[PDB]
Amino acid sequence: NPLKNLRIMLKLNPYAKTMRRNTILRQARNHKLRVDKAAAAAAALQAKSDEK
Amino acid sequence: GVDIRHNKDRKVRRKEPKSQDIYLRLLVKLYRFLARRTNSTFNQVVLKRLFMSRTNRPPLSLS
Amino acid sequence: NFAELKIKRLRKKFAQKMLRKARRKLIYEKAKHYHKEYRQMYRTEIRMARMARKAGNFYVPAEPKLAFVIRIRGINGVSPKVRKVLQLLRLRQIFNGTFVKLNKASINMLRIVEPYIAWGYPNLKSVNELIYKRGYGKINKKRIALTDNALIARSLGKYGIICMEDLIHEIYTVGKRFKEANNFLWPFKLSSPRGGMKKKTTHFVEGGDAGNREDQINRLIRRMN
Amino acid sequence: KGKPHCSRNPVLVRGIGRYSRSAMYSRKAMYKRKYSAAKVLATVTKPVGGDKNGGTRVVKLRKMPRYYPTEDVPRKLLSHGKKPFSQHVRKLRASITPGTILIILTGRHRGKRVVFLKQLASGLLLVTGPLVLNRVPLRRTHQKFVIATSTKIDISNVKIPKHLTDAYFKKKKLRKPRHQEGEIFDTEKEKYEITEQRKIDQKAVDSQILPKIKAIPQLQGYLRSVFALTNGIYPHKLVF
RNA sequence: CCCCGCGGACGCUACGCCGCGACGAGUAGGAGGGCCGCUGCGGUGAGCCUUGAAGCCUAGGGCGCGGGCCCGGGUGGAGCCG
RNA sequence: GAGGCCACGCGCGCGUCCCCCGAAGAGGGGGACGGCGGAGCGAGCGCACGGGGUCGGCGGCGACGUCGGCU
RNA sequence: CCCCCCCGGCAGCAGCACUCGCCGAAUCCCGGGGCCGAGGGAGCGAGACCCGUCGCCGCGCUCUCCCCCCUCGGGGGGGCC
Ligand SMILES: [Mg+2]
Ligand SMILES: [Mg+2]
Numbered sequence: 001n002p003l004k005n006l007r008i009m010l011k012l013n014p015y016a017k018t019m020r021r022n023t024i025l026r027q028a029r030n031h032k033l034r035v036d037k038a039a040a041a042a043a044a045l046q047a048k049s050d051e052k
Numbered sequence: 053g054v055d056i057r058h059n060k061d062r063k064v065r066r067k068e069p070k071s072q073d074i075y076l077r078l079l080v081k082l083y084r085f086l087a088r089r090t091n092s093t094f095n096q097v098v099l100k101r102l103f104m105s106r107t108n109r110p111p112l113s114l115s
Numbered sequence: 116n117f118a119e120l121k122i123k124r125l126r127k128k129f130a131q132k133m134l135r136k137a138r139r140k141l142i143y144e145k146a147k148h149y150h151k152e153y154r155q156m157y158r159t160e161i162r163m164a165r166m167a168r169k170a171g172n173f174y175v176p177a178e179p180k181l182a183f184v185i186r187i188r189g190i191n192g193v194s195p196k197v198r199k200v201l202q203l204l205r206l207r208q209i210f211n212g213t214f215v216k217l218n219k220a221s222i223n224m225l226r227i228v229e230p231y232i233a234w235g236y237p238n239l240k241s242v243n244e245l246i247y248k249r250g251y252g253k254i255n256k257k258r259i260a261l262t263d264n265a266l267i268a269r270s271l272g273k274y275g276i277i278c279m280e281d282l283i284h285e286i287y288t289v290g291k292r293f294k295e296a297n298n299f300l301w302p303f304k305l306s307s308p309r310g311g312m313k314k315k316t317t318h319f320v321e322g323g324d325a326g327n328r329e330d331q332i333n334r335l336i337r338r339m340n
Numbered sequence: 341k342g343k344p345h346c347s348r349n350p351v352l353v354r355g356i357g358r359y360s361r362s363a364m365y366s367r368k369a370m371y372k373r374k375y376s377a378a379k380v381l382a383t384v385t386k387p388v389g390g391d392k393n394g395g396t397r398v399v400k401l402r403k404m405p406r407y408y409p410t411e412d413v414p415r416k417l418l419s420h421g422k423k424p425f426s427q428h429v430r431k432l433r434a435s436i437t438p439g440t441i442l443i444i445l446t447g448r449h450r451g452k453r454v455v456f457l458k459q460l461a462s463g464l465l466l467v468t469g470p471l472v473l474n475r476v477p478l479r480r481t482h483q484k485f486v487i488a489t490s491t492k493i494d495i496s497n498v499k500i501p502k503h504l505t506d507a508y509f510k511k512k513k514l515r516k517p518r519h520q521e522g523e524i525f526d527t528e529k530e531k532y533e534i535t536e537q538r539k540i541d542q543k544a545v546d547s548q549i550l551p552k553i554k555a556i557p558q559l560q561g562y563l564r565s566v567f568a569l570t571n572g573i574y575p576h577k578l579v580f
Numbered sequence: 581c582c583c584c585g586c587g588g589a590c591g592c593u594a595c596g597c598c599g600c601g602a603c604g605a606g607u608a609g610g611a612g613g614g615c616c617g618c619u620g621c622g623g624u625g626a627g628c629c630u631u632g633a634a635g636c637c638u639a640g641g642g643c644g645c646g647g648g649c650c651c652g653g654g655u656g657g658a659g660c661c662g
Numbered sequence: 663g664a665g666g667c668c669a670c671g672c673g674c675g676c677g678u679c680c681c682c683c684g685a686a687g688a689g690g691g692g693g694a695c696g697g698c699g700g701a702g703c704g705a706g707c708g709c710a711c712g713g714g715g716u717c718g719g720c721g722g723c724g725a726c727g728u729c730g731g732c733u
Numbered sequence: 734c735c736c737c738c739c740c741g742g743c744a745g746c747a748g749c750a751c752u753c754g755c756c757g758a759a760u761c762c763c764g765g766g767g768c769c770g771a772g773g774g775a776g777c778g779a780g781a782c783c784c785g786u787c788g789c790c791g792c793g794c795u796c797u798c799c800c801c802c803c804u805c806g807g808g809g810g811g812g813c814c
């Protein structure tokens with residue numbers, strides 16, 4: 001089965017490797033962005049609650 | 053279940069001579085090989101005529 | 116002549132390898148271009164709807180030109196006209212699927228076999244899953260699995276279709292050679308719908324499964340294969 | 341020849357490198373590493389010796405077979421995988437970390453609570469619920485047939501001896517050389533003997549595992565006890 | 581110009597062997613195959629047999645989808661089978 | 663001008679476009695593209711989601727009591 | 734409490750405060766259970782000889798040179814126009 005076997009899918013469609021690599025890189029970047037943005041929101045909440 | 057009809061599955065045709073003539077069978081072997089290993093449709097026609105029956109191989113007059 | 120014949124065979128093999136490399140590069144770039152085209156169409160529909168809503172008007176999308184048809188009823192007690200139309204749609208078995216190019220004639224045939232089928236408008240993902248997981252070619256009247264691109268190229272290369280991506284593009288965007296590309300595909304032998312059906316004996320709009328569900332055919336396909 | 345380099349294409353997902361073809365071309369500098377152009381003796385000659393035996397003899401190695409069986413078996417096809425067991429990757433459950441208290445489920449030490457030390461080369465765990473506690477020596481076990489509890493001791497910075505390997509723990513046998521038909525019983529040696537080396541290793545490991553066990557209250561009692569299923573308790577409702 | 585090696589599996593009863601794909605309800609009825617079975621005749625097995633044929637019996641061992649068949653043990657006493 | 667991507671990577675000559683001086687907006691000097699032009703060749707190790715399973719993994723038990731025989 | 738405001742601002746956003754969708758070229762990663770292992774001479778090459786670790790496909794390193802980080806030659810990285 002392609003869609004389950006990476007090398008079989010690459011044999012039938014070599015561009016699937018670059019699509020998959022771009023998807024993985026994009027998802028990692030977006031996950032890092034969202035994690036950093038949530039951490040910044042939490043840090044801003046901590047600052048505005050304990051600003052003294 | 054599949055919606056197909058099985059009454060015409062088996063094609064009725066000669067795959068070999070019904071005769072037991074050993075010389076005829078030898079030259080059927082020869083033309084089987086030639087029809088398989090050449091692209092000449094003449095060999096195919098000759099082989100299928102060798103398979104045929106006597107009524108399907110009428111005599112040819114000299115005239 | 117031994118050295119000369121070694122040179123001859125090495126040159127022939129090297130030329131063959133370069134030809135394969137060139138064809139593989141062509142396949143890769145064609146798939147990239149198809150990806151660009153797909154995203155352009157998908158964004159274009161959204162953009163047209165958005166500008167119509169901004170102007171306060173209505174954007175009516177183009178009527179779908181591709182359908183997926185799944186035979187949902189068996190082969191017992193079928194009227195002759197329904198039987199003939201199912202044979203013309205190549206649905207001779209239950210849970211067989213076929214892509215149909217939509218026009219007046221095909222739609223009227225679908226109306227004839229309406230109680231026996233569930234059909235709809237597949238999306239790009241559904242076409243990809245169907246061709247990749249269950250795609251079989253009719254090569255020399257044999258059902259051959261599409262395990263190599265050479266199988267497609269030897270049968271459809273005269274039409275420009277030489278790979279899985281070309282076949283998927285021709286099926287999805289109904290091209291000039293859609294008839295040839297679709298008839299090359301053996302009808303899809305799908306499994307039973309996992310999770311069951313609602314009611315196969317009634318129409319979809321009355322709580323059943325028969326007839327035209329617009330785009331829920333994709334849900335049916337996901338459960339089906 | 342040149343020194344081997346690292347892969348220069350980090351793996352982000354198995355089977356996919358982080359960098360594309362052109363990116364790896366530039367990283368490898370293939371634009372300047374471009375190249376265009378530039379056994380075993382089967383027979384041995386030996387002096388045969390003796391007068392007028394000719395000069396020497398051309399003796400070939402691997403003489404042709406003396407006998408051929410009446411029929412053979414065709415060779416197999418090729419499988420592009422199916423690595424031997426020694427080359428298999430060894431997987432360990434995430435709940436089994438060094439120092440975890442495990443529960444043995446099979447064997448003569450059934451139901452006993454032991455201490456996990458390390459996974460070996462074959463994937464078998466090496467455990468020693470210390471012999472002074474529940475009579476479990478340094479012994480191999482299978483991770484499939486153990487239950488990893490939640491209680492752990494910090495067995496970092498203890499020295500597991502290097503010779504404690506799969507070859508070390510592999511079983512030894514005596515039978516059967518110089519003996520074909522059994523008319524006199526060969527039941528001798530059936531009493532397995534604890535080697536002095538094994539005793540020394542057990543003492544060395546336990547002397548540095550035991551103080552960490554005594555560091556937390558009544559863990560030694562926990563290790564002395566055995567696991568059992570009471571009629572009210574059910575393994576799927578139990579947190580281990 | 582093969583030769584430090586003089587070497588290199590199996591096959592192809594061609595009425596044989598091998599590959600791939602689809603298919604499998606059935607009365608009346610039709611056809612094919614039968615190394616299914618009975619009896620006798622022409623050939624053939626330098627076939628079997630009083631150191632035990634045919635037949636029969638058998639909680640014995642098996643083979644074949646099947647028709648059926650082979651072998652072990654007993655009884656039997658002169659013929660029998662591929 | 664203080665990042666990301668590319669299945670982009672030899673020369674020579676030819677073409678197409680862009681740039682400079684342009685002393686006829688001549689003639690040369692530079693970039694980008696090319697599917698153009700008469701002349702042979704990369705090999706050497708590996709890893710594997712790659713034309714249908716292997717282990718170059720292991721244990722226990724075996725004669726008057728037990729092992730196997732789905733018939 | 735409801736509606737209009739002269740107008741909103743911030744955060745989040747089909748919500749990891751489980752109110753209400755359709756989806757994936759706008760989709761990827763990982764894990765668990767079950768059933769299965771059919772096939773068996775794939776070598777254009779050395780003129781094979783230990784049982785063809787072979788074809789297609791996807792990669793890594795070397796036939797260039799600098800460095801960096803751990804071990805004590807081995808391992809892991811940055812590249813090098
Ligand atoms: Mg059927
Ligand atoms: Mg019928």
Ligand SMILES: [Mg+2]
Pocket residue numbers: 191192
């Ligand atoms: Mg009915």
Ligand SMILES: [Mg+2]
Pocket residue numbers: none
């Ligand atoms: Mg279910």
Ligand SMILES: [Mg+2]
Pocket residue numbers: none
């Ligand atoms: Mg009805």
Ligand SMILES: [Mg+2]
Pocket residue numbers: none
């Ligand atoms: Mg029938």
Ligand SMILES: [Mg+2]
Pocket residue numbers: none
């Ligand atoms: Mg969401």
Ligand SMILES: [Mg+2]
Pocket residue numbers: 772
């Ligand atoms: Mg097998």
